[PDB]
């Protein structure tokens, strides 16, 4: 057999040569002429030769996890976190194992998501003179929206911006008297502007609430407003806005229609929008030069940015916005109101549906030692090899188990080897200690 063919100088080599291979130090069975190679043999092949069982040495190891931490059942239920260290995303955190040649040790790893993904939201509000009546509803909605964000998740970013109309002779009266204010002398309306960014993304809610109140209404001559033009800048100006690798939500509220490409011909503008950030000092100074972006061109910019768009509008314009909602994918339509229940409900509904992917990273192992990962996922989904490490479509509170097997060919060192196994994007890791012995006990 292979054990006989092992030609082991000592007992330790036998174990190194094979798993079943056993060694007898009595030397009563082994022939004096025959080399210590004959002592090495199958456990059955030794017992058959009459070698004593106690004399025969067959060291093996038993799988035993040194530390075991139970996964949190709550799993941050209803966007509520007890503490960062208190939540556990891995059951077998630290484990200790002994690796013998031909004795692969397999453990079970269970991963449960006890956290909520961070969300970034940007608020865009129309300031035309016709929104003077609805101004109260828009201001109230902002504070309610921020309160929902705190309840929905621990970490969030909130920012807002405003738009009016193109600074052109046709759209806004060019008369010097109305240049200062288009509203009647009794009122004190501000000058018209294409896009004005009042606040960049920030983590403080209190600053966001106070800024919304100070906003003052502006007025233009035509019924439709340039809302599409304002969205283009926000989508492409990642630097100024402060966009990060986090789910992005855009809220747009208007009580008037939207101009589309080819509507700038009357003004005298014929250059199509290039979708390039032209914001200067947190303002848009090239509104006149570029024509309003088309729906087809506008959709492409949002898809590349992967920014979800939510529109809050009045009941009268609802029938028009619904047709647009059918066109743009991953978008929803809401009705602006004093109550503002529908606008808040859509955000919470959107947040509830989120699918993520969890992968497993393992530390380098010794030569002749390999590891196999067997993934288990929702709907009986089971991967193998590389596919068997990653799991996708996992919602919050969903737990998936993973079967890991470690096999040792030979023993590189006498001392144990500790390596850390943590999934990408998660601080929590899995430490596995592997001790291999080539000398018979």
């Amino acid at each position: 057999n292979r054990c006989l063919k092992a030609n082991a100088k000592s007992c330790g080599e036998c174990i190194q040569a094979g798993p079943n291979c056993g060694w007898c130090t009595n030397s009563t069975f082994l022939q004096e002429g025959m080399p210590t190679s004959a002592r090495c043999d199958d456990l059955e092949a030794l017992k058959k030769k009459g070698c004593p069982p106690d004399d025969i040495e067959n060291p093996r190891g038993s799988k035993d996890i040194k530390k075991n931490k139970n996964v949190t059942n709550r799993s941050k239920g209803t966007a509520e976190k007890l503490k960062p260290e208190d939540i556990h995303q891995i059951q077998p955190q630290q484990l200790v194992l002994r690796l013998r040649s031909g004795e692969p040790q397999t453990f079970t790893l269970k991963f449960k998501r006890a956290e909520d993904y961070p969300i970034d939201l940007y608020y865009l509000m129309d300031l035309s003179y016709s929104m003077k009546d609805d101004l109260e509803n828009v201001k109230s909605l902002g504070t309610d929206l921020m309160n929902e964000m705190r309840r929905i998740t621990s970490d969030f970013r909130i920012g807002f911006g405003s738009f009016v109309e193109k600074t052109v002779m046709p759209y806004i009266s060019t008369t010097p008297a109305k240049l200062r204010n288009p509203c009647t002398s009794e009122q004190n309306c501000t000058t018209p502007f294409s896009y004005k960014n009042v606040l960049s993304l920030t983590n403080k809610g209190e600053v966001f609430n106070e800024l919304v109140g100070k906003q003052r209404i502006s007025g233009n001559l035509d019924s439709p407003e340039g809302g599409f033009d304002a969205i283009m800048q926000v989508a492409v100006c990642g630097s100024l806005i402060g966009w990060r690798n986090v789910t992005r939500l855009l809220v747009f509220s208007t009580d008037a229609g939207f101009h589309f490409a080819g509507d700038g011909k009357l003004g005298g503008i014929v250059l199509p929008n290039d979708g390039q950030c032209h914001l200067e000092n947190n303002m848009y100074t090239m509104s006149h030069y570029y024509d309003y972006p088309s729906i087809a061109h506008l959709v492409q910019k949002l898809s590349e940015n992967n920014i979800q768009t939510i529109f809050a509008v009045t009941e009268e314009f609802q029938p028009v916005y619904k047709e647009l909602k059918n066109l743009i994918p991953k978008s929803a339509v809401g009705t602006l109101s004093a109550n503002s229940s529908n606008v808040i409900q859509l955000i919470i509904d959107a947040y509830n549906s989120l699918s993520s992917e969890v992968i497993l990273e393992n530390g380098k192992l010794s030569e002749g030692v390999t590891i196999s990962y067997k993934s288990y996922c929702k709907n009986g989904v089971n991967g193998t090899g590389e596919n068997g490490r990653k799991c996708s479509n996992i919602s919050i509170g969903d737990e998936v188990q993973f079967e890991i097997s470690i096999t040792s060919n030979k023993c590189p060192k006498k001392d144990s080897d500790s390596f850390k196994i943590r999934p990408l994007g998660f601080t929590e890791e899995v430490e596995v200690i592997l001790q291999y012995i080539c000398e018979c006990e």
């Epitope: 993304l201 920030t202 209190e206 800024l211 402060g242 990060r244």
Partner: antibody, heavy 121, light 111 residues
Framework: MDVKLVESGGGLVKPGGSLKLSCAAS????????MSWVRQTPEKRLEWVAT????????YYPDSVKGRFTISRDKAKNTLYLQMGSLKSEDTAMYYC?????????????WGQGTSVTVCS | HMQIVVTQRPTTMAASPGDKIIITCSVS???????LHWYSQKPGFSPKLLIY???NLASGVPPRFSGSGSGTSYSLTIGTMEAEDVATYYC?????????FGDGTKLDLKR
């Protein structure tokens, strides 16, 4: 510029003592601009102790000194007050009175002379 | 409780007059350019805001000083080093609470 900030009342404090710091703002409307307290340590590092809004509706405090200090303002006297209680050895530093020119940028544009408060064992 | 971490690459350095000095600032998480600020402090004097919004020099600041960057990378560049330019420079980010100031670079005159 043309903004005068003066901090007075700094003194040696025993561990667990209470020290009150008063900041005077002149040449500008104190209520209109948000005010904050910044202290420089003996390693020449900068740590932000507190931030108070112009309205006075809300305030911001760091975790280390959070819940152990108090910040308030007096519109009538145009004076900023920092109340310190249960002071430790780490607390000794050079405290400065600041003024945030724009809330959106959240950048400090004015810095006071400052008063040194050193804990004594 | 997640806190932004500010890092300044040259903790201490010394250069001859007319030399070009470049100091960087690393942020742990993505922030907006307007939030980032730079502060310069002379010895025996209180800190003064040299540049605001990373692209604007505070009134009373010489033209040589310049700022540029985006995302998590920033830098303060001095075209010509001068005896007055000798001070401690700190890059502070006010995007999120708490507000954190990175260790100031003790740039001084060599020999």
């Amino acid at each position: 510029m043309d903004v005068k900030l003066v901090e007075s009342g700094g003194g040696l404090v025993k561990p667990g003592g209470s020290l009150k710091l008063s900041c005077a703002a002149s040449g500008f409307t104190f209520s209109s601009y948000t005010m904050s307290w910044v202290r420089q340590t003996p390693e020449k590092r900068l740590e932000w102790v507190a931030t108070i809004s112009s309205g006075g509706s809300y305030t911001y405090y760091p975790d280390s000194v959070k819940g152990r200090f108090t910040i308030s303002r007096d519109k009538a006297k145009n004076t900023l007050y920092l109340q310190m209680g249960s002071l430790k050895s780490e607390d000794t530093a050079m405290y400065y009175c600041t003024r945030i020119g724009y809330d959106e940028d959240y950048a400090m544009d004015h810095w006071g002379q400052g008063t040194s408060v050193t804990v004594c064992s | 409780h997640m806190q932004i971490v500010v890092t300044q690459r040259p903790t201490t350095m010394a250069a001859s007059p007319g030399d070009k000095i470049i100091i960087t600032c690393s942020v742990s998480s993505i922030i907006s350019s307007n939030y980032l600020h730079w502060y310069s402090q002379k010895p025996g004097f209180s800190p003064k805001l040299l540049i605001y919004r990373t692209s604007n020099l505070a009134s009373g600041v010489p033209p040589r000083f310049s700022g540029s960057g985006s995302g998590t990378s920033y830098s303060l560049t001095i075209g010509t080093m001068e005896a007055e330019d000798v001070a401690t420079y700190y890059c502070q980010q006010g995007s999120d609470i708490p507000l954190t100031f990175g260790d100031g670079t003790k740039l001084d005159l060599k020999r």
